[model samples]
Target: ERVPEGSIRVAIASNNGEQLDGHFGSCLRFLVYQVSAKDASLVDIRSTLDVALAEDKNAWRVEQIQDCQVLYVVSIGGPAAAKVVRAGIHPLKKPKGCAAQEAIAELQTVMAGSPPPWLAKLV
Candidate 1:
């Protein structure tokens, strides 16, 4: 099988590791996961407690997860979403909270098949 060019890293904003249950602006931590066509695994938990919610908090948040290609959050504001997109990270939101692992599985399934053009760009 032909492997993707590079693994895609996704960051999920969650108060607990169970679900994508946090907002972009005030999530306690980010669960960073590395994913490929074959599988996905947790790589890190980026903490935001030390980060100050000051004037440039949005930019700071984007910077914290700059290495990631995608960010999954319950919700995000326009300004923050703009900054994230500017930094080359695609921010995705789901209406209700869902398990992080479930999301990852679904993403991997898409990767294994024919991913959409936009998603194909991540590899």
Candidate 2:
């Protein structure tokens, strides 16, 4: 695997660790990673299935990966997305979610390319 010169932490909402498959509000857990243009390494996995919801459920979940610069979710409510953005994390939706690595790979392509405006500010 290629090493990263610098990387951003990413959070992928997932029911199972293998796939990028989960929604913001009810995801079973989050798969956290350190990712760059050509590399990705899973840093941690977190579960929310049994956690208590806070007054602001969105804020509760968003805080789990507060260090992540980006997030991948199958679906996220507008309110939840706003919370994420306000926390300085960019949210991405992949309705037809795929394997976790596959999703990370696509992100790598952008990290390695002429990134879109929002992403250009990151990698």
Candidate 3:
């Protein structure tokens, strides 16, 4: 089931201005999208970037980054990627023009990595 009105953390790592919607920004960016649990409809896109350097660290900590249960990222790279890996939330690198529902399905397949030994017994 897809999460609705649920928030996920994403670290946007990119130096290319074209890829960043011509903002030429490299700070932490927040992207929110809605996904229906039943029909799997991904809707409602609200995007924003945090340019205030003073708040970057706090934003990173308070804005659901490493502790989120779900994570949907775009163009994930190096340091951010490492953090996500540590969080245990599967990282879904959203491709261009990819719909959230379809992307989630694909992510279910790829991000379905092996669980710890304790979890194997439950399955």
Candidate 4:
């Protein structure tokens, strides 16, 4: 499956790891959010990777938000990073040390690299 040529896709993921919190939870939790050229503010959130891909099997559709070209994931591990890299998506690890809303803002900065890429491209 291929994403429609020339169209850009991005995914947003948040993780709760064990290392940082000194807990036994070591799962790569992710929330894959998507936005296309058509709509910017409206982000479609995908709960699971399988469901994301099932939605579109033909085009280079993101079955998992992690499969998109750009990904915004919170604190993660080596395994999670490898998965994202394999899918052709660059995972930008965010500092989970901040508030949820602030973390998202920081994520946007990292993904866009300055003035934020989506605002200019999508808006």
Clash count per candidate: 0, 0, 0, 5
Compared with the true structure, what per-residue lDDT tens digits does model 3 show for residues 1-123?
Answer: 233342232222222321322111233433333322222333322334444544554335334444334455455555655665676655546545344445545533433445334323222
RMSD in angstroms, candidate 3?
A: 7.0
lDDT of 2 by residue, 8-103 (tens): 888999997578889989999999888977778888898875447467688889889788888999999999999999999989889999898988
Prediction 4 global C-alpha lDDT: 0.43
Worst 10 residues of 1 by lDDT: 1-10
lDDT, model 3: 0.39
Best by TM-score: 2
Clashing pairs in 1: none
Residue runs of model 1 more than 4 Å from their true location after superposition:
1-5
Would you estimate the TM-scores of all the predictions?
A: 0.87, 0.87, 0.43, 0.45
Name the 10 consecutive residues with the lowest summed lDDT in model 3: 16-25
Candidate 2, lDDT over the whole model = 0.85
- Please rank every candidate by TM-score, starting with the best: 2, 1, 4, 3
Best of the candidates, lDDT? 2
Local accuracy of candidate 1 as per-residue lDDT tens digits, 14-122: 9985688999988998999888878787888888976775567888788789988888998999998999999989888875979998778877888888987877776
* Model 4 C-alpha lDDT per residue in residues 1-123, reported as the tens digit of each score: 344443445554533421121101122333333443332332444434343345333122233454456655445566656665677666565554433344345545544554355444432
| All-Cα superposition RMSD per candidate | 3.5, 3.3, 7.0, 8.3
